Amino acid sequence: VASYDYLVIGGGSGGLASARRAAELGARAAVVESHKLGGTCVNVGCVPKKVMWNTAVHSEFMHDHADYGFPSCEGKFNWRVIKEKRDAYVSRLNAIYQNNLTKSHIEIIRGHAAFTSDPKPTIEVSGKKYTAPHILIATGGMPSTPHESQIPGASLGITSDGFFQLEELPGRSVIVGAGYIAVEMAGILSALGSKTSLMIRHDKVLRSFDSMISTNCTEELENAGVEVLKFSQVKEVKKTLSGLEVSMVTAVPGRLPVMTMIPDVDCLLWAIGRVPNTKDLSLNKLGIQTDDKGHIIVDEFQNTNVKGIYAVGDVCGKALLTPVAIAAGRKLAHRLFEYKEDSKLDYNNIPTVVFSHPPIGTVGLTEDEAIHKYGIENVKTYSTSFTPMYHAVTKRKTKCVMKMVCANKEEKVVGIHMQGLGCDEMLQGFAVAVKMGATKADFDNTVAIHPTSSEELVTLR
Amino acid sequence: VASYDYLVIGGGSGGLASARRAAELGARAAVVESHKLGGTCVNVGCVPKKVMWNTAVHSEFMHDHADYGFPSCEGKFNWRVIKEKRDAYVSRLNAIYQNNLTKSHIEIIRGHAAFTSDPKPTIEVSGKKYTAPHILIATGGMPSTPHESQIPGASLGITSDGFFQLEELPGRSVIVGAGYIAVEMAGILSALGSKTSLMIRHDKVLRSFDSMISTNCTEELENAGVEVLKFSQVKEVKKTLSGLEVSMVTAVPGRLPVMTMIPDVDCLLWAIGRVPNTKDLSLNKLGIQTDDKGHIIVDEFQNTNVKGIYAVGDVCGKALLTPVAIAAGRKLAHRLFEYKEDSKLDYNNIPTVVFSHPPIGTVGLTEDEAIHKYGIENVKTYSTSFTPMYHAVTKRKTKCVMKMVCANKEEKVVGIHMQGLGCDEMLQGFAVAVKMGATKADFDNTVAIHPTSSEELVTLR
Ligand SMILES: Cc1cc2nc3c(=O)[nH]c(=O)nc-3n(C[C@H](O)[C@H](O)[C@H](O)COP(=O)(O)OP(=O)(O)OC[C@H]3O[C@@H](n4cnc5c(N)ncnc54)[C@H](O)[C@@H]3O)c2cc1C
Ligand SMILES: Cc1cc2nc3c(=O)[nH]c(=O)nc-3n(C[C@H](O)[C@H](O)[C@H](O)COP(=O)(O)OP(=O)(O)OC[C@H]3O[C@@H](n4cnc5c(N)ncnc54)[C@H](O)[C@@H]3O)c2cc1C
Ligand SMILES: N[C@@H](CCC(=O)N[C@@H](CSSC[C@H](NC(=O)CC[C@H](N)C(=O)O)C(=O)NCC(=O)O)C(=O)NCC(=O)O)C(=O)O
Ligand SMILES: N[C@@H](CCC(=O)N[C@@H](CSSC[C@H](NC(=O)CC[C@H](N)C(=O)O)C(=O)NCC(=O)O)C(=O)NCC(=O)O)C(=O)O
């Protein structure tokens, strides 16, 4: 039994960040990783997605070429060219992260970890045992797929993991789900020329976002050629002579249900959610508490119910983002190795960007959330809608919408929501201001930058 | 003599903004405008510039088309296409601003105003007199050109005003000056295919910006095909059989001066500075104080030395930006018509974006300025240099540089400087944070947005 100061299960965003910080603090740490370092974000998440987004963005801008005085750009996108370059980039990152661990003197244990029956919390990886007075579980999650039992032929569709393995652009694609990944994939496939449908259970996407965003986002998708099938769900999928055939039920409220077959489908993509990866950890050998979806339960300091066992990131199932896992992993290292007992992550005011077309940025409370928190009488919003100057000369248009949610008489800024060109890079600094407790006066007293989209947020009336 | 509550001389950024706010407050106002409403920013400044920048940006992105899996885009930019659309857009804005005044019940007096000899401050426009207990001078400025006396043939070159009248892309262009307009014009001309030289008196552009920016900017220009002629100045210009021929002296320190002729120049563009437009106002009839360049002198509340006479914007010659004139014009209206005596613009921490390639954003103190203000022992900077993920797959590269200037033990953020893709839209919110007095802790405690360039500012170590 080899002992360490800190054992980290999972070499993804949270696991890498926590191990690295702990090592800086003097801890003798090891990272257990069964697949590729960098975890979901590097291999099949943030990175490859952003590359594909940049690619789709190229497609769109190329539609405006002629408006801008250039000669028309003619054609066919070549999927394998970009696919090969994307894969190489990911390989580069895998090598970098491995180096990052080595330079920090962090041991890398390759293989799948599971807890043992042993009294003191101990793990086994390939027949060898390892132990530490502090063990971090950061095994992340995976894409959720339906059971053949409830949707026959569901196994014929792929997930976002499968998306990153595609070698050719699918002719016809159907995406099921209404959350960020669904929206992002539909947007990439459509821009690159796939005849895309997005199938959602209700009438809008991103229904958990502020209502101005879910509405606007649903519209922009339609404007960009994505067919949004509302109140629809898959009833069954089958392999026909040439592609898949999707049976769906459309149940608009106030209407009779109607069944429709979708033929000649090349790609059926499930983007219905993520499941935590805890199934094969042998948690129950230590009685570690999970919820009914398999998420590990933790307190505000990332503690599990078992002393010296912590969990961070996607496995805990809250705020499923790379930077959250990183921040929580880091705070935890300071608490354990720097004896900063108050060291923990504040889960309020975490900013998010959705790489749609145009991108979405949000931080803080939606209007409804502020209303429930402070009361209708105490919430005031400010909003704007405009056409970015970029489209002053194009036949193709997109809009920019922004909304500011204020609370109390002071008009404290409690939420910012926007969609529009530039929004992906614009959010960060306002997120700083919101975190600091800025009020509308603070925004208003900041001199604008002209001409930009960002200035609109500081001149709301 | 028609009397008003507020008379505004000049219908540009500051004049329009001040008149509009004053009218909301109940003032009976009139705007005197001799040319087109919208002033410099709309007609020959911010607006037409940004359109041309978006155009140049198209040119660059089109160089990356093939890297991104598309087929090569072949060719020739057509200047008149975009020129015509740009002009129309400007016409649209002129009509909008006229409407904006009318809806506010602001009178528009068309023609050139000048003060009279009359005891109580009174102006004349086309033989008619007008007076008000509060008169705002907001006549803006103009491009500076050399005297034929000092540079023979200087009148053969054009200024940024002339740039906006060009109907064809110049084959060969030489830009003289090293400030923002010079940098911006060189960047647009070069990207659109003009064989461009930028002639500067020293070794770097933007020498008043933080030194990381002047260095980086000078390099990025060279990388983008702009020939930067250092320690060079024009000695004379002459009209040859086919274009202009520019005689220049190059005086590198530690070397003998060398004279060079630049032949076959289509466009010589002077971007050496701006002069205030006060020459024809008859200021001296009221003894209004100006400096030796003709700028009107004001106090912190925009008062001139004469009671009931104020000046804002470019004419005062400080912080020559549209949003500054607007903010100062607005604050002034509140002070005069809302009796808010403390109402004035804080000229510290005004953010600026330079539309170079890539764009530059800056707010607050340069490292040197912080050093002079707090002392070397009390200043700490943090900086980063990286390749944006956009270029992970391109043969063409650009860099992103960021620098954070902190002061005292608290590490108050007193300056932010950066250059890179996305920087134009990224600045605004950090400018809010800086204005609020954020410290490095406040930035560090803000969760990052991944993957973006903006996150780099919140994860500096
Ligand atoms: C398509 C997609 C796009 C996304 N885009 C973004 C984005 O743009 N921005 C963003 O912020 N977030 C994005 N995310 C989310 C982000 O990827 C996750 O929040 C983040 O990766 C979670 O980090 P983690 O450390 O919890 O787990 P992961 O990064 O999943 O790491 C878990 C690691 O543990 C390993 N492992 C699991 N079990 C074991 C075991 N028993 N033994 C050994 N090793 C084990 C796994 O192989 C893996 O490498 C995206 C996700 C997806 C799926
Ligand atoms: C090429 C260029 C690019 C620029 N780009 C930007 C940018 O991207 N962002 C930015 O923030 N700033 C930019 N600026 C600067 C910005 O344009 C100025 O700071 C702003 O226009 C100054 O506003 P103002 O109200 O002082 O004067 P102006 O907008 O110049 O208005 C002065 C007005 O007064 C009128 N006038 C003058 N004298 C008289 C008289 N005697 N009687 C009647 N009418 C009179 C003039 O016709 C004019 O319309 C740019 C400037 C230039 C030249
Ligand atoms: N953000 C810019 C620059 C591009 C970029 O971020 N490139 C790196 C790979 S990002 S995916 C891996 C992820 N890293 C992050 O989330 C950034 C964290 C941030 N730097 C911070 O310090 O908080 C991750 O798993 N991190 C774990 C960890 O940091 O321990 C890159 O080049 N990495 C290689 C390297 O030099 O180390 C952009 O998007 O353009
Ligand atoms: N900023 C966005 C949207 C594009 C945009 O700004 N379009 C307007 C013309 S901008 S040039 C005239 C300038 N206006 C500004 O500087 C914006 C001021 C800001 N809105 C504020 O309230 O502080 C000006 O001279 N303003 C004087 C004044 O505001 O009184 C536009 O469409 N204007 C027409 C209109 O609807 O009124 C982008 O860049 O994409």
mmCIF file of C-alpha atoms in Angstrom, chain A residues 257-372:
data_model
loop_
_atom_site.group_PDB
_atom_site.id
_atom_site.type_symbol
_atom_site.label_atom_id
_atom_site.label_comp_id
_atom_site.label_asym_id
_atom_site.label_seq_id
_atom_site.Cartn_x
_atom_site.Cartn_y
_atom_site.Cartn_z
ATOM 1 C CA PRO A 257 -51.095 14.191 -31.279
ATOM 2 C CA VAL A 258 -49.667 13.429 -34.716
ATOM 3 C CA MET A 259 -47.070 10.800 -35.618
ATOM 4 C CA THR A 260 -44.456 11.619 -38.299
ATOM 5 C CA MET A 261 -41.726 9.557 -39.872
ATOM 6 C CA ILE A 262 -38.379 11.274 -40.588
ATOM 7 C CA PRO A 263 -36.611 9.480 -43.401
ATOM 8 C CA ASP A 264 -33.161 9.302 -44.779
ATOM 9 C CA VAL A 265 -31.485 10.454 -41.607
ATOM 10 C CA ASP A 266 -27.715 10.143 -41.599
ATOM 11 C CA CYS A 267 -27.094 11.363 -38.084
ATOM 12 C CA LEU A 268 -29.339 11.117 -35.042
ATOM 13 C CA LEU A 269 -27.723 12.874 -32.137
ATOM 14 C CA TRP A 270 -28.931 12.482 -28.556
ATOM 15 C CA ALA A 271 -28.247 15.621 -26.494
ATOM 16 C CA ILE A 272 -30.528 14.913 -23.604
ATOM 17 C CA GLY A 273 -28.200 15.284 -20.564
ATOM 18 C CA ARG A 274 -25.216 13.766 -18.749
ATOM 19 C CA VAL A 275 -24.881 11.013 -16.194
ATOM 20 C CA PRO A 276 -22.197 11.007 -13.455
ATOM 21 C CA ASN A 277 -19.459 8.468 -13.774
ATOM 22 C CA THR A 278 -19.662 6.746 -10.334
ATOM 23 C CA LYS A 279 -21.113 3.447 -11.361
ATOM 24 C CA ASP A 280 -17.810 1.540 -11.271
ATOM 25 C CA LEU A 281 -16.127 3.220 -8.274
ATOM 26 C CA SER A 282 -17.399 0.810 -5.618
ATOM 27 C CA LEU A 283 -18.674 3.761 -3.557
ATOM 28 C CA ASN A 284 -20.974 1.589 -1.564
ATOM 29 C CA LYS A 285 -17.942 -0.187 -0.063
ATOM 30 C CA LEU A 286 -17.388 3.008 1.879
ATOM 31 C CA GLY A 287 -21.040 4.032 2.073
ATOM 32 C CA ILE A 288 -20.384 7.217 0.146
ATOM 33 C CA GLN A 289 -23.727 9.025 -0.369
ATOM 34 C CA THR A 290 -25.000 9.551 -3.883
ATOM 35 C CA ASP A 291 -28.348 10.826 -5.131
ATOM 36 C CA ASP A 292 -30.626 8.749 -7.248
ATOM 37 C CA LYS A 293 -28.880 9.699 -10.507
ATOM 38 C CA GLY A 294 -25.539 8.488 -9.109
ATOM 39 C CA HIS A 295 -24.156 11.990 -8.280
ATOM 40 C CA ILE A 296 -21.912 12.191 -5.310
ATOM 41 C CA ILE A 297 -23.378 14.325 -2.522
ATOM 42 C CA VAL A 298 -21.052 16.947 -0.998
ATOM 43 C CA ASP A 299 -21.352 19.907 1.378
ATOM 44 C CA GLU A 300 -20.249 23.517 0.629
ATOM 45 C CA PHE A 301 -16.569 22.524 1.115
ATOM 46 C CA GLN A 302 -16.795 19.583 -1.281
ATOM 47 C CA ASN A 303 -16.778 17.060 1.543
ATOM 48 C CA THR A 304 -18.587 13.756 1.024
ATOM 49 C CA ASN A 305 -20.240 12.151 4.034
ATOM 50 C CA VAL A 306 -17.048 10.197 4.610
ATOM 51 C CA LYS A 307 -14.088 11.887 6.319
ATOM 52 C CA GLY A 308 -11.089 12.522 4.006
ATOM 53 C CA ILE A 309 -13.126 11.887 0.830
ATOM 54 C CA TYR A 310 -14.064 14.822 -1.387
ATOM 55 C CA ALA A 311 -15.668 15.250 -4.788
ATOM 56 C CA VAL A 312 -15.599 18.113 -7.311
ATOM 57 C CA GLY A 313 -16.754 18.848 -10.846
ATOM 58 C CA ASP A 314 -19.314 17.124 -13.043
ATOM 59 C CA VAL A 315 -19.588 14.127 -10.750
ATOM 60 C CA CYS A 316 -21.409 16.214 -8.145
ATOM 61 C CA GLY A 317 -23.783 17.250 -10.841
ATOM 62 C CA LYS A 318 -23.919 20.967 -10.143
ATOM 63 C CA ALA A 319 -22.770 23.728 -12.550
ATOM 64 C CA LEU A 320 -21.258 21.339 -15.161
ATOM 65 C CA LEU A 321 -18.506 23.608 -16.476
ATOM 66 C CA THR A 322 -14.694 23.288 -16.659
ATOM 67 C CA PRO A 323 -13.918 26.469 -14.851
ATOM 68 C CA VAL A 324 -16.212 25.482 -11.918
ATOM 69 C CA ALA A 325 -14.444 22.161 -11.459
ATOM 70 C CA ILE A 326 -11.072 23.964 -11.678
ATOM 71 C CA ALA A 327 -12.070 26.677 -9.108
ATOM 72 C CA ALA A 328 -13.588 24.201 -6.716
ATOM 73 C CA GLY A 329 -10.537 21.889 -7.094
ATOM 74 C CA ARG A 330 -8.187 24.810 -6.335
ATOM 75 C CA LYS A 331 -10.132 26.100 -3.337
ATOM 76 C CA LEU A 332 -10.128 22.579 -1.953
ATOM 77 C CA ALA A 333 -6.340 22.300 -2.236
ATOM 78 C CA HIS A 334 -5.897 25.556 -0.295
ATOM 79 C CA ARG A 335 -8.280 24.335 2.391
ATOM 80 C CA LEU A 336 -6.530 20.951 2.797
ATOM 81 C CA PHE A 337 -2.863 21.969 2.229
ATOM 82 C CA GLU A 338 -2.868 25.559 3.286
ATOM 83 C CA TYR A 339 -5.216 25.118 6.252
ATOM 84 C CA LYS A 340 -7.588 27.840 4.931
ATOM 85 C CA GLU A 341 -10.757 26.482 6.504
ATOM 86 C CA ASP A 342 -13.034 29.083 4.932
ATOM 87 C CA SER A 343 -11.672 28.162 1.509
ATOM 88 C CA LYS A 344 -14.558 27.139 -0.768
ATOM 89 C CA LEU A 345 -16.187 28.081 -4.095
ATOM 90 C CA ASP A 346 -19.149 30.417 -4.186
ATOM 91 C CA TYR A 347 -21.555 28.882 -6.686
ATOM 92 C CA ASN A 348 -23.460 32.121 -7.237
ATOM 93 C CA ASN A 349 -22.752 34.419 -10.130
ATOM 94 C CA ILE A 350 -20.877 31.845 -12.253
ATOM 95 C CA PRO A 351 -20.815 33.149 -15.842
ATOM 96 C CA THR A 352 -21.698 30.955 -18.877
ATOM 97 C CA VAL A 353 -21.304 31.337 -22.603
ATOM 98 C CA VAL A 354 -23.260 29.234 -25.056
ATOM 99 C CA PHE A 355 -21.503 29.019 -28.427
ATOM 100 C CA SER A 356 -24.601 29.449 -30.542
ATOM 101 C CA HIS A 357 -24.890 31.758 -33.537
ATOM 102 C CA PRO A 358 -24.694 34.459 -32.295
ATOM 103 C CA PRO A 359 -23.180 33.440 -28.947
ATOM 104 C CA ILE A 360 -25.012 33.786 -25.635
ATOM 105 C CA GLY A 361 -23.514 35.094 -22.390
ATOM 106 C CA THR A 362 -25.260 35.027 -19.022
ATOM 107 C CA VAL A 363 -24.353 35.636 -15.355
ATOM 108 C CA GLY A 364 -26.509 35.850 -12.225
ATOM 109 C CA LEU A 365 -30.276 35.713 -11.789
ATOM 110 C CA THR A 366 -32.872 35.458 -14.537
ATOM 111 C CA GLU A 367 -35.724 37.964 -14.235
ATOM 112 C CA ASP A 368 -37.953 35.288 -12.730
ATOM 113 C CA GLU A 369 -35.351 34.219 -10.251
ATOM 114 C CA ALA A 370 -34.875 37.839 -9.086
ATOM 115 C CA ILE A 371 -38.599 38.201 -8.817
ATOM 116 C CA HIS A 372 -38.850 35.131 -6.581
#
